[PDB]
Amino acid sequence: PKTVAPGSTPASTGGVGLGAWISVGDASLRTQLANGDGSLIGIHPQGTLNNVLTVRTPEQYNAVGDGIADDTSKLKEMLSDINNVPETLPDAAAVNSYMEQVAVKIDLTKLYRFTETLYIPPGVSIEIPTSNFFTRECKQGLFYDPVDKNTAAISLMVYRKQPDGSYKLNKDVDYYPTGLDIDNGDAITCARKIDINNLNLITAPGVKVGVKWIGGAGCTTKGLSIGENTGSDITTARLPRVGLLQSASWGSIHENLRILYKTQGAVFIDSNGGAAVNNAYISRLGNTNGELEQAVYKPAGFTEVGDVAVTQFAGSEVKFNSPIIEQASFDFVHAGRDTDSYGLFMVDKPHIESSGGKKKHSFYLINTSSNVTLSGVGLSGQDPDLDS
Amino acid sequence: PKTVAPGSTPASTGGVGLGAWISVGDASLRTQLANGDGSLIGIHPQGTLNNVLTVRTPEQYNAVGDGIADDTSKLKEMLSDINNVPETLPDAAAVNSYMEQVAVKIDLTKLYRFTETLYIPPGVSIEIPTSNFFTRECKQGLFYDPVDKNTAAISLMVYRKQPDGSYKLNKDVDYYPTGLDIDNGDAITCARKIDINNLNLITAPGVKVGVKWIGGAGCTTKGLSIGENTGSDITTARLPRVGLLQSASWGSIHENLRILYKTQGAVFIDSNGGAAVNNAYISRLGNTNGELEQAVYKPAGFTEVGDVAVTQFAGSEVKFNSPIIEQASFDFVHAGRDTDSYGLFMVDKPHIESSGGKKKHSFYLINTSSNVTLSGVGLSGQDPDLDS
């Protein structure tokens, strides 16, 4: 005989399974199926449902997905269930351990409004069926809508050494690690085994940075699409002032990156050795008042006013293959490293265009060398004296 | 007490759920499972089955998938359930709205015979596990087998203005939009957010065009494989006369495109700014009687007879990276724009080969400039006077 004390549960008096408690009847079956993992469902050629379910979705966490409800806590929980990295770690060993976890794929099929910077932990693959392209109304992806706009929508994880030798997660929007920081231990990257395939990211107007791709060595992207082609008034368009900011990401590849921006499209700083940006399509949403934008992250030597599609400095030497750059005051601003002019400016066959032939310069090169191959597409501005 | 009138249903008497009707018993459970969406099946770490099923398949619509039965209506129903765009629309706002719908991924794992031109609507991602490569018998993908062979197997959507001011979906095999048409309002593309991975397309012998990539700006492809290596005799091989016809597709990227053709491999016309074709493998199925093939879509300046692997004109300037071209009379025929010779012919390291060294010309350049990088692979024809 089996004695069951008052206040017992099947889980606390032997568990459910052979030799212990066995579910019997329809009510039990319903609950067993409702709270299971799919192991009760057989599949072909063999095995069970749980054997083949490997992707995660925000819907598993009850995200509304209408771009209205604040789905922040659900997105964080989904991410946490994959790799939950504490914001303060004791030492280098602890932070590095988080890059050694199981990687999981996430599928985003609706629109998720969020209001705090999302930090992607290592071991995360994100996918959406197709990438946005000058899309008028984003229907799938992420919509950053914070109170504090002096922030980034998405950011990779980089830990900064504290006075006591401990490491805290970086949460400063303007911060980016340098090759020096990584070398001398002041910064430790916690960004690896991260893959993006078609992520659409829109932001409330005025958000400072779309994506902070910091410390993402070896991390890859395909079809990353930033910003919404909301309408003619860029002042109210759902796109960030700065699309992407990247540093310490050697060996990182961005394939067919799409960026709609207001102030700066993409910025690459410091160590990005061997990184490539192929077939990028980076455009300001029209060039109305573009000449009045003030670059946010730029080398000291660049003091001109005007929006910049691609900015690179401090020794960064990303390879730009066949980029398409539209409606920019400055297509490219590139400065070599201050010390020795290191950092080759490399652009192969840029497709440069601007409505009404409005432009200041295509290649604003500072203290540097370059190899550029033109493809018969381009122009110089309307000012007969200063544009070239 | 609850009174239920004769002829009632749970729906007509309060509905199902808390405080209303609750299903009970095995018979109810079986029907609930059969007619539900998987919401009764819990999955890990939390949530239910319906939360992670996002991919569509023709089997959901009971397609036979044997390459024999006509699966046309079922393929069309699947595409329609994703984005049902009317063949006739009121105005530009109307046609443009259909590019703002949720995108859905489709997985094709069997072989589907169809008999009418399939029109892919915006917001569709097509996937097949692997791509064909000179395969003799196509086991997965689409098989176009129409009564009227003077048609296309697959086409993107482009709307043409009518005299009354309304727009109708183009169904003309020869039509292709130009920059003018787009600027005039005479044509409005309805092809955005389209992604193809490993699609295998085979067609009945005599079919004019394999794929009409018209207006596919920003649309992408990887492993798109056209034509079957049926047998030695090309007159009965299951491949189209013209593999791919493309226009108004600026920023589109075709990665590892594979085309087995009879008359022309790929044709690029008009605006294709910034578009790229990487690692394409284009080949006629043997050069037998190739010199007799008459190009269908070509510039006025090209009057020679012979099959052409790649044809480009009217200002199109697609970047061809490492293409592999085989068994063609003419590897590339390229014409600069009529008015000003615009449109650079760019080919980097083409791998050109042909059986028995049969060939007329590799680069047939008309009113144009070009930048070509040879990789030590090539040849010139057997005619000691005319071949170069």
Numbering used by the authors:
A (entry chain C), B (entry chain A): 131 to 518
What's the publication's text?
In contrast, CBA120 contained multiple genes for putative TSPs (TSP1-TSP4), genes that are more commonly associated with Podoviridae rather than Myoviridae. The TSP1 trimer assumes an elongated rod-like shape of approximately 170 Å in length and 75 Å in diameter at the widest region.
The crystal's asymmetric unit contains the biological homotrimer. In addition to electrostatic and hydrophobic interactions, oligomerization of the three head binding domains is enhanced by the coordination to the Zn2+. A short α-helix (amino acid residues 155–165) forms a “neck” that connects the head binding and receptor binding domains.
